[PDB]
Amino acid sequence: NHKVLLIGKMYDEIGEKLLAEYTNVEIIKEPKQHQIHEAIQDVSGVFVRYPTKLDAQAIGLAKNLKVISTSGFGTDAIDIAAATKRGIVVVNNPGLSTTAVTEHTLSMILALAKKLTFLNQCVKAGNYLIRNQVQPIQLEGKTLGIVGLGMIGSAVAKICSTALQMRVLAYDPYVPSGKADTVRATLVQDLDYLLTESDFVSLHPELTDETCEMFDLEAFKKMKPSAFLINTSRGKVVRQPDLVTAIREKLIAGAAIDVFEPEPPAINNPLYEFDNVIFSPHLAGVTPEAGMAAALSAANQILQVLQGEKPPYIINPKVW
Amino acid sequence: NHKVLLIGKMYDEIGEKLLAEYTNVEIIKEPKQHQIHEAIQDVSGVFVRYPTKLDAQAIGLAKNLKVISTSGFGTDAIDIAAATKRGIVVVNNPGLSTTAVTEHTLSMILALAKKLTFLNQCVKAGNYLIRNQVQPIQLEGKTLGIVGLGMIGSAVAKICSTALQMRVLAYDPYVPSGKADTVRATLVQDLDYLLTESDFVSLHPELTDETCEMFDLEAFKKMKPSAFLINTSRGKVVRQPDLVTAIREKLIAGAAIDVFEPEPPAINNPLYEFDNVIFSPHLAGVTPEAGMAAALSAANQILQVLQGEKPPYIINPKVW
Numbered sequence: 001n002h003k004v005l006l007i008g009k010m011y012d013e014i015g016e017k018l019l020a021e022y023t024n025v026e027i028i029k030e031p032k033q034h035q036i037h038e039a040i041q042d043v044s045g046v047f048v049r050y051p052t053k054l055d056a057q058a059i060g061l062a063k064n065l066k067v068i069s070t071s072g073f074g075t076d077a078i079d080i081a082a083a084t085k086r087g088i089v090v091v092n093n094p095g096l097s098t099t100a101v102t103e104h105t106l107s108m109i110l111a112l113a114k115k116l117t118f119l120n121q122c123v124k125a126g127n128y129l130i131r132n133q134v135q136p137i138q139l140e141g142k143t144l145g146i147v148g149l150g151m152i153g154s155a156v157a158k159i160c161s162t163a164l165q166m167r168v169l170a171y172d173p174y175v176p177s178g179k180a181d182t183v184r185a186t187l188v189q190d191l192d193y194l195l196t197e198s199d200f201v202s203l204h205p206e207l208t209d210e211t212c213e214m215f216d217l218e219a220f221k222k223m224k225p226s227a228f229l230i231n232t233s234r235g236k237v238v239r240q241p242d243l244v245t246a247i248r249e250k251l252i253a254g255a256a257i258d259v260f261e262p263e264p265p266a267i268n269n270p271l272y273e274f275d276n277v278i279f280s281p282h283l284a285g286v287t288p289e290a291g292m293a294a295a296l297s298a299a300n301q302i303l304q305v306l307q308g309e310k311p312p313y314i315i316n317p318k319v320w
Numbered sequence: 321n322h323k324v325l326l327i328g329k330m331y332d333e334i335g336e337k338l339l340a341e342y343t344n345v346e347i348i349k350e351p352k353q354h355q356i357h358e359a360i361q362d363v364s365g366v367f368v369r370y371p372t373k374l375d376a377q378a379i380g381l382a383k384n385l386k387v388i389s390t391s392g393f394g395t396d397a398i399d400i401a402a403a404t405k406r407g408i409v410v411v412n413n414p415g416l417s418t419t420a421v422t423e424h425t426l427s428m429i430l431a432l433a434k435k436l437t438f439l440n441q442c443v444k445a446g447n448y449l450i451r452n453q454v455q456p457i458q459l460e461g462k463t464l465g466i467v468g469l470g471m472i473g474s475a476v477a478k479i480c481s482t483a484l485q486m487r488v489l490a491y492d493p494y495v496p497s498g499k500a501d502t503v504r505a506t507l508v509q510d511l512d513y514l515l516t517e518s519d520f521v522s523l524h525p526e527l528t529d530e531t532c533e534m535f536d537l538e539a540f541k542k543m544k545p546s547a548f549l550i551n552t553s554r555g556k557v558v559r560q561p562d563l564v565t566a567i568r569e570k571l572i573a574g575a576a577i578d579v580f581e582p583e584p585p586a587i588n589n590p591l592y593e594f595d596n597v598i599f600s601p602h603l604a605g606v607t608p609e610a611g612m613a614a615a616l617s618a619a620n621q622i623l624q625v626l627q628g629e630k631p632p633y634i635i636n637p638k639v640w
């Protein structure tokens with residue numbers, strides 16, 4: 001008897017089939033606003049594919065709505081205030097993609113070190129002789145600076161220190177030094193030391209008021225001119241105009257970016273111009289395996305709310 | 321009193337400085353044939369930067385020449401027959417870049433799995449919404465097929481099986497099964513099984529009559545349509561027209577190529593057209609660290625011959 005609207009497909013169809021066994025499911029892909037308005041009127045649950053926005057108008061039209069689930073961690077595209085006003089439960093699906101982001105981070109570190117995209121373009125252009133001018137970087141013995149020694153930061157640190165034989169430094173004010181020792185990294189309390197020491201800086205912190213735009217022009221100035229920045233965390237950790245300046249003025253050597261501010265990025269983003277910046281469209285956490293886990297978690301939590309059971313990942317717990 | 325000619329720079333200047341302390345060194349970069357002819361007339365030793373060719377004419381003009389050293393393993397660009405006729409020692413510099421090629425191989429496996437070059441182009445073109453159509457591959461649990469369980473094959477196997485938690489199969493007729501167990505791989509005697517099982521096939525064999533063009537159309541037909549080929553070994557291991565067919569006809573999903581046949585490749589190579597084939601210009605073994613080791617080895621062996629000491633890596637030992 002309950003109806004559920006998926007605003008965008010889940011990252012794996014198993015969550016859609018789980019929902020369809022217990023509710024009447026409708027899926028709308030890259031919808032126009034009027035389609036959201038018509039399809040949401042009588043549904044009891046809503047799923048939102050990141051980074052699609054769910055606004056106050058649509059929530060106000062959703063007369064029967066009891067639960068909203070995002071596809072992953074981020075809830076910035078949901079008008080949570082409007083949902084909370086109406087007593088609607090908002091749920092996210094976090095921490096299900098550690099392995100996916102760890103692998104993606106490694107791919108980006110290696111791609112920057114081996115100058116992958118540049119050398120590929122040179123060969124295809126007939127310039128095999130570029131090998132007389134540029135050489136890859138050997139990762140062994142170089143220093144990797146990890147900002148945020150959490151689930152993904154620790155996993156990346158462990159692979160880079162042991163398999164790749166890098167020297168790993170980690171900055172994270174909320175962790176004991178023993179947590180870095182576990183993954184054969186060294187914890188450092190001075191972010192400046194991490195910046196001046198690192199040949200690769202990879203960002204993995206939680207986004208907070210403290211980490212918001214912590215990577216600004218002053219940070220890039222302290223980094224080695226030869227160093228690379230990798231960001232798979234959140235776009236707001238980096239102040240985008242300063243990264244543009246830093247790349248253009250050669251304060252750093254390059255960057256690999258999976259996350260943007262804003263999300264989605266505009267089509268004229270000034271970073272696109274630079275051949276030493278490489279991009280993925282917020283996919284580090286979206287392998288099929290991570291997608292299946294997130295889709296099951298989203299489907300489960302919707303069904304839980306509809307049956308009056310408290311789900312694990314409520315974002316606005318005061319409505320419960 | 322001895323003069324030495326470097327036909328191309330070494331991969332690190334330390335070898336040039338070592339030579340200049342004991343001999344009179346001249347360096348010519350991307351030289352025309354007439355420059356080789358003039359500079360080689362009176363030199364006692366010659367260094368050749370891969371893949372530059374040293375032909376019978378130049379050797380015949382080199383009246384005082386006693387030793388020729390390549391920059392790395394490959395000697396196919398040297399007219400060894402002509403050198404041997406004149407009693408000239410030919411030396412290569414092999415096995416000094418295991419870590420460099422291992423890292424490069426990993427970079428290419430990860431770049432193919434994460435669809436790096438394609439997703440980068442999509443974002444820069446304003447197509448962030450490609451994330452609704454393509455997803456990265458999670459390496460954990462996938463099968464890597466290694467052809468050739470030597471120094472580089474073993475090192476790659478070990479990282480992929482342990483750090484990346486892949487299932488690793490290895491084909492190598494000259495190795496005991498215990499050598500695969502050491503790196504948490506399984507040795508397989510049926511190359512067909514490796515082909516049908518593997519999601520990634522990475523080539524690391526010695527080039528022999530047996531491995532020459534072992535990766536031909538029949539091999540690609542047996543591979544999974546979803547699988548990727550990585551080749552950092554030698555270009556002649558793959559029959560290039562068949563790889564073109566295999567890519568065009570979607571017998572396999574993509575490839576990453578560091579080595580070519582012929583070397584250097586022509587500017588109209590038919591593989592360049594395909595966006596799912598990525599290239600590096602024979603640089604997997606050429607980091608600064610590998611380059612310094614090879615340059616010291618080349619400089620040492622030249623000086624050894626000039627002082628009548630047998631060098632370790634003679635390619636034509638019957639002249640000694």
Ligand SMILES: NC(=O)c1ccc[n+]([C@@H]2O[C@H](COP(=O)([O-])OP(=O)(O)OC[C@H]3O[C@@H](n4cnc5c(N)ncnc54)[C@H](O)[C@@H]3O)[C@@H](O)[C@H]2O)c1
Nearest residue numbers: 148149150151152171172174204205206210232233284285
């Ligand atoms: N690109 C994607 O698809 C994707 C997927 C999953 C997670 N993420 C993001 O990646 C990042 C890491 O994820 P996680 O699961 O490891 O989170 P986590 O909660 O396990 O760890 C985050 C770390 O950030 C640390 N931190 C907090 N403040 C800090 C500060 N001022 N300086 C340095 N570190 C600080 C915390 O102490 C914690 O250890 C998060 O921003 C997460 O939202 C991105």
Ligand SMILES: NC(=O)c1ccc[n+]([C@@H]2O[C@H](COP(=O)([O-])OP(=O)(O)OC[C@H]3O[C@@H](n4cnc5c(N)ncnc54)[C@H](O)[C@@H]3O)[C@@H](O)[C@H]2O)c1
Nearest residue numbers: 468469470471472491492494524525526530552553604605
């Ligand atoms: N791209 C570069 O810059 C670069 C640099 C160094 C080496 N290489 C090449 O990489 C490859 C691996 O180098 P390595 O140092 O590990 O060599 P290696 O001699 O240590 O191992 C080569 C392996 O090939 C195996 N092999 C022989 N015949 C085989 C067959 N029919 N099928 C499967 N395996 C077979 C041998 O048994 C051996 O174990 C070689 O071709 C080498 O010349 C390339």
